[PDB]
Amino acid sequence: KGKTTLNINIKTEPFSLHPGLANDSVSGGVIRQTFEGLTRINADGEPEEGMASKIETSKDGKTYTFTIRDGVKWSNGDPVTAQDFEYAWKWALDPNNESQYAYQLYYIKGAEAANTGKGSLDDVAVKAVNDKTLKVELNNPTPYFTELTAFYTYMPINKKIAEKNKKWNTNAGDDYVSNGPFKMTAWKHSGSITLEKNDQYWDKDKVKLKKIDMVMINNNNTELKKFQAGELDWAGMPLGQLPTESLPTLKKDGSLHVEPIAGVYWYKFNTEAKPLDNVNIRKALTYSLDRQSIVKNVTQGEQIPAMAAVPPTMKGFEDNKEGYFKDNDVKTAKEYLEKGLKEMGLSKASDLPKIKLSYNTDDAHAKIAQAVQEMWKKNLGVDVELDNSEWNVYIDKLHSQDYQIGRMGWLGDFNDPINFLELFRDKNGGNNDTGWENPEFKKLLNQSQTETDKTKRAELLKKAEGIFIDEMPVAPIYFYTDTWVQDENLKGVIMPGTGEVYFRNAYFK
Amino acid sequence: SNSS
């Protein structure tokens, strides 16, 4: 009875379908169906055995021994080996490959040194001891390492093919092979992606869908129309997006799903571009936002105002609902503005250098940017000009620091607060892009990773978070929800609360 | 990860 094709929207072309380069929710939406790591995420939101059938940990918690599952194969039928993992991780750490997620592998001994030119890749402590054994040594006991091994930077890639064709990842075809529940059988760039069930997947009997058809419709009204005609089985997040004005009606008819997730919506400042190089200007722009108005009137998705970096759903950080400063604090915003102008020798806001606010082309981002533009004009007398870019282009714009203020969202990679902080540890961190670094911040993050006590560790990270908010390299705006509607016959979808979605075991009733 |  239940159909076996799932029709969904992913809005736009992914940034990369190389797991070692992907850094974004669009790419990740695809790669989380097509690749599998040493571990995978089960329905309870916890890591479990995936490509590794056994995971051993040394007594000190630093050395991991993965036994590769008997008979695991790539989609072309070749065995998945430990050398595929070694190759992939070293590939992501090789500075020549310019992964923005190389820092995700710094947990491994020798990784940072290799990535920053202070060491050989040969001395990164990931080793295929044999075809079925991967040995990994960490700098510190990392209790969430098996969450990291399910993260897409830690996916294997087919070493044989990647050596043959260094552009293997750029198109569907015989040189694009993967090891997950689904495999990618078509990719029309900027059009659509077709995934089909992967008959070489080890746990294929648990996979019920035969086809996932992913379209790329960046018009939220159209996505909802297609859903309402039954041409899509889902409308909304994580991979699609509902029109903000539909949310009242859908909430009222009882069809809307709304779930808080570990994510934050912020405007990044290029702290090396005037006038955003002045902390008082950054603070004026941040304190002058009315986040309650944005979430009530603009987004309408039950998001909560963010005056902090770490989402309050992170155990130990629930007081971030209140945050580090007052929402809509125009009085204090104006005080910061005056202080900044004085430091420049200026008297009025209109004499500041021109400011551009950038975002990725999107119905909702444009509305938020317009609302913020008005708040800046009205509360500070600051005029900004707006510009928008395609998502995959936009990521590179921010990474190259070709911006002044840039909208971004960050979703948790793993269930620990440091994931919201360590992207800003190093100036040249692949996902930083603010030009900011602070020596005490970095010291505190590094100390956090040697502390096993959860209280003392949470306090080190809260101190770090306070330093970050005091230097305001980004303007927090809101903490995310996922909002969607779906065919209620679609069961078995895994949505862990970090904002990802897995269709591995999904089915129509 | 960066959210679209």
Strands A182-188, A63-68: pairing kind: unpaired
Consecutive H or E run containing A37: none
State the Cα–Cα distance between residues A85 and A124, nearest whole angstrom: 13
A199-204 long-range contacts, CB within 8 A, separation 24+: A200/A73, A200/A74, A200/A75, A200/A76, A200/A77, A201/A36, A201/A73, A201/A75, A202/A69, A202/A71, A202/A72, A202/A73, A203/A504
- Based on its alpha-carbon atoms, the radius of gyration of chain B, rounded to whole angstroms, reads 4
Residues on chain B touching A413 (C-beta within 8 angstroms) = 1
Of A12, A413, A431, the CB nearest to B4: A12
Q: Which of A388, A397, A391, A350 is nearest to A370 (CA)?
A: A388
Tokens of A321: 């609902």
First to last CA, chain B: 10
Cα gap A87→A18, rounded to integer Å: 13
Nearest-angstrom CA–CA distance, A236 and A227: 10
- Report how far Cα A506 is from the mean position of its chain's Cα atoms: 23
Q: Is the peptide bond before A275 cis (omega within 30 degrees of 0)?
A: yes
Torsion angle of C-alpha atoms A94, A99, A103, A104, degrees rounded to 10: -110
State the SS3 of A306-341.
Answer: CCCCCCCCCCCCHHHHCCCCCCCCHHHHHHHHHHHH
Question: B4: which chain A residues are within 8 Å (Cβ-Cβ)?
Answer: 11-12, 24-26, 360, 362, 391, 409
Both tokens assigned to A55: 């995971």
Q: Could you tell me which chain A residue has the CA closest to the CA of B2?
A: A24
The residues in B 1-4 lying below 8 A from A, measured between CB atoms, are 1-4
Residue A11, chain B, CB below 8 Å: the answer is yes
Provide the 8-state DSSP code for A486: E
Which residues of A fall within a CB distance of 8 Å from B3? 24-25, 263, 265, 408-411, 480, 499
Query: How many whole angstroms separate alpha carbon B1 and alpha carbon A502?
Result: 16
Using a CB-CB cut-off of 8 Å, the residues of chain A touching B1 are 22-25, 28, 410-411, 413
Say if CB A176 and CB A168 are below 8 A apart. yes
Whole-angstrom Cα distance, residue A376 to residue A92?
40
Resolution (A): 1.5
- Residue A357's nearest CA partner among A379, A396, A388, A397 is A388
Which of A13, A26, A148, A267 to mutate to test binding with chain B, by most B CBs within 10 Å of its CB? A26
CA dihedral (A311, A317, A318, A321) positive or negative: negative
What residues contact residue A16 under an 8 Å CB cut-off, 6+ apart? A22, A23, A27, A169
Contacts with A312 (C-beta within 8 Å, 6 or more apart), sequence order: A304, A318, A319, A320, A321, A479
Residue A302: left if φ>0, alpha if ψ -120 to 50, beta else—which one?
left
Closest CA to A104 of A396, A458, A431, A394: A431
Calpha distance A234→A104 (Å, rounded): 31
Spell out the domain ranges in chain A: 1-35+159-262+482-509, 36-158, 263-481
CB contact, 8 Å: A26 with chain B? yes
